[PDB]
Amino acid sequence: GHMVNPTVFFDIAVDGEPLGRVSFELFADKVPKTAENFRALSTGEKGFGYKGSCFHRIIPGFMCQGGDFTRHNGTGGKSIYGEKFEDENFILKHTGPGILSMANAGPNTNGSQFFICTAKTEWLDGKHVVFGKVKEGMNIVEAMERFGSRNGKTSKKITIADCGQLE
């Protein structure tokens, strides 16, 4: 039947203590290649992905950034496509808190790093591929956000203790 946009979850921990679950709708109907990358990295089904990785940069009033599961500091990560991959489209815009979007290092350099907006970030439109949104647990993102700082360093260790697909 109809392709249903996937739902994936992160179970977040703070210095190893459970915080809560954030779930995301992935817009596979608009950005299928970008949605599939994040989906597969969330289930771990290729043998690598987000489980155990950290949020390395959190700026209150802006965004939480994660997905560097290879170097844990924003210099690493990889997609499921054996190389960085193209900006699929910029159809979806950075409209407010909860938007899930790809981090990158230039045109057509998407890997595994992503960010969750905690504010409207419209100046990123046409530069970062929006591919999902928080579905449930925006309150957990708001709780994470409090452990960031102006320069992005986190004051507690924010990890994805578990992750996977709900639907």
Q: Is 56 a catalytic residue?
A: no
Q: Token digits for 34?
A: 């970008």
Among 104, 136, 143, 156, binds ligand UMM (CB under 6 A): 104
Q: Is 128 a catalytic residue?
A: yes
Among 8, 58, 59, 64, binds ligand UMM (CB under 6 A): 59
Return the residues of window 120-159 that contact ligand UMM according to CB under 6 A: 152
Q: Is 37 a catalytic residue?
A: no
Among 1-9, 17-25, 40-48, 56-64, the segment contacting ligand UMM (CB under 6 A): 56-64
Q: Kind of pairing, strands 63-66 and 57-59?
A: antiparallel
Q: Please say whether the beta carbons of 19 and 10 come within 8 A.
A: no
Q: Is 131 a catalytic residue?
A: no
- Angle, vertex CA 105, rays to CA 147 and CA 153, nearest 5: 15
Q: Kind of pairing, strands 17-26 and 57-59?
A: unpaired
Give me the least distance between CB of 151 and ligand UMM, in Å please.
9
